Amino acid sequence: MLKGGVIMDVVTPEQAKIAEKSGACAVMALESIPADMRKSGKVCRMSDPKMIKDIMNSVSIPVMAKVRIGHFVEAQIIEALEVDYIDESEVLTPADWTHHIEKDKFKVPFVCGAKDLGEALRRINEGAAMIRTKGEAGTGDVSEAVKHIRRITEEIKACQQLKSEDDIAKVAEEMRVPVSLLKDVLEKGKLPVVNFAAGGVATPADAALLMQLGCDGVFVGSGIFKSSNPVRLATAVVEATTHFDNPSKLLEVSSDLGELM
Amino acid sequence: MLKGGVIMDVVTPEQAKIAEKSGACAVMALESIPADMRKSGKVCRMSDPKMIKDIMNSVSIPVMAKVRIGHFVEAQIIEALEVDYIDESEVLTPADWTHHIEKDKFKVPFVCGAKDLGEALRRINEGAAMIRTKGEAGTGDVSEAVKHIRRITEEIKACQQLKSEDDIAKVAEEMRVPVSLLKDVLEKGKLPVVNFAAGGVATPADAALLMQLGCDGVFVGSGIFKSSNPVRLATAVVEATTHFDNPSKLLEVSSDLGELM
Amino acid sequence: MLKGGVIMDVVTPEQAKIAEKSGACAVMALESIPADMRKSGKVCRMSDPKMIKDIMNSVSIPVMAKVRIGHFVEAQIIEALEVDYIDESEVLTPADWTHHIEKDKFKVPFVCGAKDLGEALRRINEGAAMIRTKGEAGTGDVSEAVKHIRRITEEIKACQQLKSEDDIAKVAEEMRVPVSLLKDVLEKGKLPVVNFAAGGVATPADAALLMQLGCDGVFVGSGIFKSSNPVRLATAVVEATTHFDNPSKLLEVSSDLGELM
Amino acid sequence: MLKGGVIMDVVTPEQAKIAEKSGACAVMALESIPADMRKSGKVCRMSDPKMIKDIMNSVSIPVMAKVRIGHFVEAQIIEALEVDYIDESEVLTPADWTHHIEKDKFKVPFVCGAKDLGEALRRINEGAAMIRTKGEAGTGDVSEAVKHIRRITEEIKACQQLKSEDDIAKVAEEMRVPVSLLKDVLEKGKLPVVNFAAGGVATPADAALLMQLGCDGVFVGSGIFKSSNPVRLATAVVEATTHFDNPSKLLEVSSDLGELM
Amino acid sequence: MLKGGVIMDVVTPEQAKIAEKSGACAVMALESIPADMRKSGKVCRMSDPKMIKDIMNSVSIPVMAKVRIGHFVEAQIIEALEVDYIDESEVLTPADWTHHIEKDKFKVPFVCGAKDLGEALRRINEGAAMIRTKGEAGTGDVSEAVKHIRRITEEIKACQQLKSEDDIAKVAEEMRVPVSLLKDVLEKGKLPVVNFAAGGVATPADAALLMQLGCDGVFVGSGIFKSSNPVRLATAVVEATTHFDNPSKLLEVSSDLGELM
Amino acid sequence: MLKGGVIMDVVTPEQAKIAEKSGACAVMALESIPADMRKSGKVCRMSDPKMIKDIMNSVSIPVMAKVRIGHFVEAQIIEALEVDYIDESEVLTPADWTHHIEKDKFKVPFVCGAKDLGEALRRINEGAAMIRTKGEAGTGDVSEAVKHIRRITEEIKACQQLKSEDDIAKVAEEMRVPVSLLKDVLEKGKLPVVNFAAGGVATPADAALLMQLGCDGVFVGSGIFKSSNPVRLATAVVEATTHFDNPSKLLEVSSDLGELM
Ligand SMILES: Cc1ncc(COP(=O)(O)O)c(C=O)c1O
Ligand SMILES: Cc1ncc(COP(=O)(O)O)c(C=O)c1O
Ligand SMILES: Cc1ncc(COP(=O)(O)O)c(C=O)c1O
Ligand SMILES: Cc1ncc(COP(=O)(O)O)c(C=O)c1O
Ligand SMILES: Cc1ncc(COP(=O)(O)O)c(C=O)c1O
Ligand SMILES: Cc1ncc(COP(=O)(O)O)c(C=O)c1O
């Protein structure tokens, strides 16, 4: 559905239109770039619903919004607003350092970040409909996202090497998830939900790299709109994500991209 | 009496009138924002009784005032002034690092902060009429308040898991409170007094979040009056605290709030 | 004699007159505020005898002067000057880090600071006629003074719990004082000399707080004269010290005090 | 082929022409000096293919381009561009902190850095066609490059001292390479591929020093073009690399070189 | 001879004349205040002999000069200059951190600093004709000098408590001095040479304090000449040193001294 | 040949002429004061051969030049230039942190620094023709040079105390030198080559001090030429080095030297 797509962060209706025209499969509405806020020491929260609504009114692709980790009231509000997806985001200032939102009590689907298999499974267990890497937001450095997708893949493989079901159960207990969840992953060799790349995806090559590592899609941040040519960069990232294993196409969209970050 | 209400910090009579009009159940008189003072290294004490009295004269809702931890003479003075409640506040510069005020020797009711069950019970044992979270004053970050309310709830539940009354008694001894106090809490599953949210409540969503977590009311700080639209923000926070489990109402009051913190 | 009184630091003859008019029981002559000097890294010594004499000539209440810890020659000079009391003061730069002055070889009475029971007893043993808390000079934070008076009281009570006279004697040896001194304190439940509050007394409430904690009088520093209304503040502190147990009187003198510290 | 040659970093077509005229055996195309970028905290990536192509069009010697460690999509793009060599470079911001590129799946040859024998063998095992020291890029300090070439030589000699084939196999396992690779190196006393000097080569003397230590060629950085006389310096470095064992020639090219770094 | 006298640091012939007129028993010639130099990180050495000679030519009291610890050539030079005393001074930058000068190979007498009994005895053993405290030069804080004179006195007394000659010999070995030296001290209850106070003597009271603690004389530094009234201060210090146990005289010279340090 | 002489650092032909006229036995050509460079973080290398040659052409005394530690190519170049001595200098930025130059493969004589006996012997073993202390270059503080000459002397004496030739051999092994080298030193009681003082020699007295400590000559740095009177200072240092045991001569040359460092 969003599979194979690019979700783009947008801070205005006009940015959302550019995203849509470029071929984004969805847009992530936010009033403020948390990266900048974060480096300011400011508290970053759910965006003003009126701003999210102005973005929803400007495009016909799905709209996502972020809430603070554990902030189930921000989520209730965003859900009442009828956004299509809620990102329970570590990029905003966490509201609860112990508990994430009980996502399975909502009707709107959530995406959650994960750095490893344990995290991914706990998030899924809590009700996440979609997982993404945590990467390193606002840095334009793809290596954190790469590290997370590699780690989840590696841990899955390592768990498949355990030949005892008791050992498996002990791993599940350590992860704080139902053994049946872990066992399903080990049989299928993959998470039961889509896993998107997010955080530090700066170039078309970065996007294609994460797709080739096995991501189902990519989130790109506000860097797109700080580049000297946002429409061209946005379009190139979408093309790279679509044609992620076509080197000549990747060469063609990467050429003459102009000034980035 | 204040249950389900919002108490607002005010530094002038005109701010108190705004609080009253907005639907605040009470006002907390202070001559100086301790948050700013604190970051200045200044010593923050009881406010000048004349400034408190000017606030008392300007509204008909109850008025609270702060005194330094352990400062029983500041409390005697505030009590003679006939304020309605005394907040023995960690936000002011502590006067005694060992002993809190013997609040049960006063006729005026006290509110005290607590970070966990032990602290809450010691403060109640000393005579506190009301408990509030300590949160993180002046930061606009709700996570400390959330952490405290969660911790008290968790410790209560954990203590309910003990079956040895000797174990209970050992916990009470470690907490330095009468076992009968601890036992009453374990039976009722809750503190014998109201517990308010305080410190870092910045948005209507924050206020509702703490009510849903089981708080009985909320304190909001001077951030209200630093916002670009104080009356609107104050009103929205009161509405959210009242209708804390009505998402469409929460959506409505959160929309177009203007610039905060 | 000085019991129940306020001693005020003064740096000029005119300040001494204000102190006297306000009802101070004595004045503490000093040419320089050691608090400011201290924060300058400067060495603070006995004041010039000429400045002290100019203060002695301007009032008819007793005059005190400070000497550096261990500086028995400064004390011999101040004694020859005929001041009424000598404060061997940790606020000045210590002259001897090992030995305090042999005060019992002087005719003029000394006051010494103490942070705990051991210190108080050694100072009394050396010949101090009066003890005062060490508080935290120049900070306007009363909590150090409170801590010292609480500590002395607590240690006395703890020693009263011992019932081996051998244990008592072991405590006296650790404190480096004659067992008869310690035993006298344990029987009477108090020091054999007056104990005054000093260091960080900034408000009338602070003064009364220390009296209620059991001090016999208070020293106040140069903060009085940095306030926007010195005469009013000085008078209020004297009144609070006199009527330290009268809340309505305390309320009355604390009101509309103006800008402090 | 490149053996005995100098490869020069160039950031424009005109710099590439100078390199070629000076006698460089190849040029390393990069849009930005990663040294400067690095000290800016910026992320350094593959250069824009258009800038690389403009350099390829300006000279007839081979052109190299860098990709981030582990970034196999950048490499696929550069390969499609038909550069002659790909430098998987630790000077750019690493994309994968765990896995290097699977170089043996490409047709274009790669050069990789190595600090010791283990690193060199793993890079060769992954498919590197050429090894170079990692030196210390942008510092003009030759000692890191010297350290690496010395270390590889020393480790080879130390391994040649082992006479248990089991011990050899244990070393290969620790290095994570096939024992046959390690054994080949121990028999021939050298790596199976050319080893170039790179990082911190600032003077003709530095270039010759590394050749005498056994390197097969040298990479020089953008320092060449920051000197007061680039053509002269570039020519001198090429001459020194060619006549690395001829002291009078080395003297002649080192003389009157002008202002460096 | 110098016993009971004040030696004053002087940096010019005119300062030396003031010292002489004031009643100084000797002058210490130095071209630069090492205190200021020290805080500048500068290396402080023997003063230019021409400057020392200009001072020797301006007064008829003895002149001293400083050399760096261990710098026996500076001493040979000063000796050839015919100064009356050489101060091997820790205030200058040490030339030898292991060995002091072999003073007994010179004809001119040396003064050396000591912080404790061991140091004093080693210096005497090396040939020092006179000992002084090290104090804390340029600080105007007398407490270091007090500490050293107290420590030497205490260690002497403690050694007199040893009733075994073997124990004594073990102490001497630890001190690295001949047992006969230590034994002479223990019998006489004092050092075999005069011990002067030096470092941080700022007031007449300070000078008299050190005399009453048992010093045989005092060194005062350049602080004298930075005071608002050098002649008056110099004269007062000499009088205090002469009449060190006459309190009314000490009172008289300490009065109206003007601005110090 | 240089024994009993002063070698002076010079940065221009005119400075070299001054050195020559002053009686320097040799000059040390360098284009830059490494002391200043060092404090700038800059990399300091062999000087441009053209600047060295211009100095060689301006005087008829021997000329030395520095090369980086381990930089045998810089040495080959300087050797081809026909300088008289090569200083393998820790003052320049080391090129090899593991290996010094194989100096016995050169025809030109080398001087090397040493801090202790082990270092001196390894440098002699490698082929050094002359040893010098390392001192502390550019500081004008003679104590490091003093420390090194003292340490070498002390270690020689300590080794002479060993009676076990096996013990000797064990020391040689720890030092990484042939036992015959160490044994020759122990018999002769001295190094088999001249040992010069270097680093921090600022005054004529310093120079004489090091000669009396047993040095065979002295290196002085660029401090000479920063003094207010270079010719006078240079001449005084040469005279002091020549007449290093004549106090009245030392007095005469030390007088009225003007402003140093
Ligand atoms: C950024 C971030 N990641 C992860 C978590 C929690 O993940 P988990 O509970 O699985 O350890 C939190 C909260 O502590 C968080 O703020
Ligand atoms: C912020 C704060 N919390 C708590 C306390 C004390 O709480 P308790 O006595 O339960 O440890 C203090 C001072 O004593 C305090 O300053
Ligand atoms: C401020 C102060 N209080 C107390 C002491 C001495 O107190 P006592 O010796 O009793 O520990 C000194 C320490 O040297 C001191 O300077
Ligand atoms: C610069 C650099 N060298 C080497 C490595 C990898 O080398 P190896 O895996 O062989 O240790 C990496 C580490 O992640 C690296 O970034
Ligand atoms: C200031 C100072 N005091 C003392 C010494 C040496 O004294 P002793 O050798 O007795 O330890 C030195 C040198 O180390 C010194 O510089
Ligand atoms: C200042 C300095 N001293 C000494 C050395 C090495 O001396 P050794 O090999 O004897 O340890 C080095 C570099 O290797 C150095 O930089």
Q: The CATH number of the domain where B114 resides is what?
A: 3.20.20.70
Q: What span, in angstroms and rounded, lies between the C-alpha atoms of B144 and F86? A: 68
- Per CB-CB distance under 8 Å, the chain D contacts of A205 are 45-46, 71, 73-74, 77
Give every CB contact of residue C165 below 8 A, 6+ residues apart in sequence: none
Contact E195, E215 (CB under 8 A): yes
Q: What span, in angstroms and rounded, lies between the C-alpha atoms of B82 and B101? A: 18
**Helix (H) or strand (E) segment spanning residue C4:** none
Give every CB contact of residue E183 below 8 A, 6+ residues apart in sequence: E168, E172
Tokens 């009355």 sit at which residue? C252
* Contacts A–B by Cβ distance under 8 A: 67
User: Domain residues for F136?
Assistant: 1-261
- Chain A contacts to D (CB-CB under 8 A): 139-143, 146-147, 150, 202-203, 205-206, 208-209, 212, 247-248, 250-251, 254-257, 261
Q: What span, in angstroms and rounded, lies between the C-alpha atoms of D89 and E232? A: 76
Ligand nearest to the CA of A133: 1
* CB atoms B77 and C206 under 8 Å: no
Residue E63 C-alpha, separation from nearest chain C C-alpha, in angstroms: 30
CB neighbours (10 Å) of residue E219?
28
- Per CB-CB distance under 8 Å, the chain C contacts of E229 are none
φ, ψ for residue B26 (rounded to 5)? -165, 170
Q: What span, in angstroms and rounded, lies between the C-alpha atoms of D111 and D85? A: 7
The answer to whether the annotation marks E200 as part of a ligand binding site is yes
Q: What span, in angstroms and rounded, lies between the C-alpha atoms of F198 and B247? A: 82
Contact D129, D109 (CB under 8 A): yes
One-letter amino acid of D31: E
The separation between the first and the last C-alpha atoms of chain C, rounded to the nearest angstrom, is: 30
Nearest to A113 by CA among D185, E16, A101, B261: A101
The protein residue whose alpha carbon is closest to atom 11 in ligand 6 is: F119
Q: Is the CB of C90 under 6 A from ligand 3?
A: yes
Strands lying side by side in the sheet with C26-29 = C195-196, C130-133, C110-114, C85-89, C63-68, C26-29, C6-10, C218-220
Q: What span, in angstroms and rounded, lies between the C-alpha atoms of E113 and E68? A: 12
* CB atoms A95 and B212 under 8 Å: no
Burial of residue E17, with CB atoms counted within 10 A of its CB: 0-12 exposed, 13-18 middle, 19 or more buried: middle
Nearest to F234 by CA among F33, F23, F62, F55: F23
φ, ψ for residue A93 (rounded to 5)? -70, 120
Catalytic, D105? Answer: no
Q: What span, in angstroms and rounded, lies between the C-alpha atoms of E115 and E126? A: 16
Angle at D197 between CA D196 and CA D201, to 5 degrees: 150
What SS3 string covers chain F?
Answer: CCCCCEEEEECCHHHHHHHHHHCCCEEEECCCCHHHHHCCCCCCCCCCHHHHHHHHCCCCCCEEEEEECCCHHHHHHHHHCCCCEEEEECCCCCCCCCCCCCHHHCCCCEEEEECCHHHHHHHHHHCCCEEEECCCCCCCCCHHHHHHHHHHHHHHHHHHCCCCHHHHHHHHHHHCCCHHHHHHHHHHCCCCCCEEECCCCCCHHHHHHHHHCCCCCEEECCHHHHCCCHHHHHHHHHHHHHCCCCHHHHHHHHCCCCCCC
Length of chain A, in residues: 261
φ, ψ for residue D7 (rounded to 5)? -105, 130
- Per CB-CB distance under 8 Å, the chain A contacts of B251 are 49, 77, 80-81
Q: What span, in angstroms and rounded, lies between the C-alpha atoms of F248 and D201? A: 54
Q: What span, in angstroms and rounded, lies between the C-alpha atoms of D230 and D225? A: 5
Angle at C161 between CA C156 and CA C165, to 5 degrees: 95
SS3 category, B49: helix
Nearest to B88 by CA among B112, B124, B115, B104: B112
Dist. CA A97 → ligand 1 center (Å): 7
> What are residue F8's DSSP bridge partners?
F27, F220
The minimum-distance atom of ligand 6 relative to the CA of F134 is: 1
What resolution in angstroms, rounded to 1 decimal?
2.2
Residue C83 C-alpha, separation from nearest chain E C-alpha, in angstroms: 12
Alpha-carbon radius of gyration of chain B: 18
Buried b (16+ CB within 10 A) or exposed e, A172-187: beebebebebbeebbe
Listing DSSP states for A104-140 in one string gives GG-SS-EEEEESSHHHHHHHHHHT-SEEEE---TTS-
Nearest to C66 by CA among C93, C40, C41: C93
Q: What span, in angstroms and rounded, lies between the C-alpha atoms of C145 and C123? A: 17
Q: What span, in angstroms and rounded, lies between the C-alpha atoms of E236 and E254? A: 7
Residue D48 C-alpha, separation from nearest chain A C-alpha, in angstroms: 6
Nearest to B70 by CA among B33, B49, B44, B96: B96
Q: Is the CB of A126 under 6 A from ligand 1?
A: no
Tell me how far the alpha carbon of residue C250 is from its chain's centroid. Answer: 22
Contact F220, F168 (CB under 8 A): no
Nearest chain D alpha carbon to A139: D43
* CB atoms B48 and C248 under 8 Å: no
Query: Residue B95: which of C143, C250, C256 has the nearest Cβ?
Result: C143
Contact B197, B144 (CB under 8 A): no
Ligand 6 neighbours, Cβ below 6 Å, are F 69, 90, 94, 97, 119, 122
Nearest to B194 by CA among B163, B219, B231, B224: B219
Strands D6-10 and D26-29, how do they pair? parallel
> What are residue E89's DSSP bridge partners?
E68
Strands C110-114 and C6-10, how do they pair? unpaired
Q: Is the CB of B94 under 6 A from ligand 2?
A: yes
Total domains in chain A come to 1
Nearest to B68 by CA among B49, B86, B52, B50: B86
The minimum-distance atom of ligand 2 relative to the CA of B134 is: 1
Q: What span, in angstroms and rounded, lies between the C-alpha atoms of C94 and C70? A: 7
Contact E69, E92 (CB under 8 A): yes
Query: Residue F73: which of D147, D250, D255 has the nearest Cβ?
Result: D250
Tell me which DSSP letter residue D125 carries: H
Distances (CA, A) of A252 to A115, A132, A237, A244, D80: 32, 28, 12, 12, 10
φ, ψ for residue F3 (rounded to 5)? -40, 130
One-letter amino acid of E169: A
Contact F124, F104 (CB under 8 A): no
Nearest chain A alpha carbon to B206: A73
φ, ψ for residue C186 (rounded to 5)? -65, -35
Contact E88, E101 (CB under 8 A): yes
Nearest chain A alpha carbon to D43: A141
- Per CB-CB distance under 8 Å, the chain C contacts of E140 are 43
The protein residue whose alpha carbon is closest to atom 2 in ligand 5 is: E90
Give every CB contact of residue E116 below 8 A, 6+ residues apart in sequence: E148, E151, E152, E155
One-letter amino acid of B46: M
The separation between the first and the last C-alpha atoms of chain B, rounded to the nearest angstrom, is: 30
Distances (CA, A) of E169 to E162, E181, E186, E193: 11, 10, 12, 21
Query: Residue D250: which of F80, F95, F99 has the nearest Cβ?
Result: F80
Q: What share of chain C is helix, strand, coil (3-state, %, to 5)?
A: 45, 15, 40
Residues in chain E followed by a break, C to N above 2.5 angstroms: none
Contact A167, A133 (CB under 8 A): no
Provide the angle, in degrees to the nearest 10, between the axes of the packed helices F72-80 and D247-254.
Answer: 90
Tell me how far the alpha carbon of residue D73 is from its chain's centroid. Answer: 21
Residue F240 C-alpha, separation from nearest chain E C-alpha, in angstroms: 11
The two tokens of residue E261 are 């340090």
Q: Is the CB of B247 under 6 A from ligand 2?
A: no
Query: Residue C93: which of E141, E147, E256 has the nearest Cβ?
Result: E141
Q: Which chains touch F (3 or more CB pairs under 8 A)?
A: D, E
Contact C233, C256 (CB under 8 A): no
Contacts of residues D151-155 at CB distance under 8 Å and 24 or more positions apart, as own/partner, are D151/D115, D151/D116, D151/D117, D152/D114, D152/D116, D152/D117, D152/D120, D152/D191, D152/D195, D153/D213, D153/D214, D155/D116, D155/D117, D155/D118
One-letter amino acid of A53: K
The answer to whether the annotation marks E217 as part of a ligand binding site is no
Give every CB contact of residue F116 below 8 A, 6+ residues apart in sequence: F148, F151, F152, F155
Listing DSSP states for E195-237 in one string gives EEB-SS--SHHHHHHHHHTT-S-EEE-THHHHSS-HHHHHHHH
The answer to whether the annotation marks F9 as part of a ligand binding site is yes
Tell me how far the alpha carbon of residue A3 is from its chain's centroid. Answer: 12
Give every CB contact of residue D158 below 8 A, 6+ residues apart in sequence: none
Contact A224, A207 (CB under 8 A): no
Q: What span, in angstroms and rounded, lies between the C-alpha atoms of B4 and B18? A: 19
Tell me which DSSP letter residue C209 carries: H
The minimum-distance atom of ligand 5 relative to the CA of E90 is: 1
Nearest to E101 by CA among E79, E78, E77, E72: E72
Contact E146, C95 (CB under 8 A): yes
Q: What span, in angstroms and rounded, lies between the C-alpha atoms of F108 and F100? A: 16
The protein residue whose alpha carbon is closest to atom 12 in ligand 2 is: B97
Q: What span, in angstroms and rounded, lies between the C-alpha atoms of C92 and C30? A: 11
Q: What span, in angstroms and rounded, lies between the C-alpha atoms of C232 and C21? A: 11
Q: What span, in angstroms and rounded, lies between the C-alpha atoms of A192 and D182? A: 43
Q: What span, in angstroms and rounded, lies between the C-alpha atoms of A211 and A244? A: 6
SS3 category, C65: strand
Nearest chain E alpha carbon to C71: E209
Ligand 5 neighbours, Cβ below 6 Å, are E 69, 90, 94, 97, 119, 122
Contact C237, C231 (CB under 8 A): no
Chains E and D contact (Cβ–Cβ under 8 Å for 3 or more pairs): no
Strands C130-133 and C195-196, how do they pair? parallel
Q: What span, in angstroms and rounded, lies between the C-alpha atoms of A47 and A67? A: 8
Burial of residue F158, with CB atoms counted within 10 A of its CB: 0-12 exposed, 13-18 middle, 19 or more buried: exposed
Nearest to A48 by CA among A8, A12, A15: A12
Burial of residue D179, with CB atoms counted within 10 A of its CB: 0-12 exposed, 13-18 middle, 19 or more buried: middle
Chains C and F contact (Cβ–Cβ under 8 Å for 3 or more pairs): no
Give every CB contact of residue C180 below 8 A, 6+ residues apart in sequence: none
The minimum-distance atom of ligand 4 relative to the CA of D122 is: 10
Contact F69, F93 (CB under 8 A): no
Q: What share of chain A is helix, strand, coil (3-state, %, to 5)?
A: 45, 15, 40
φ, ψ for residue A76 (rounded to 5)? -60, -40
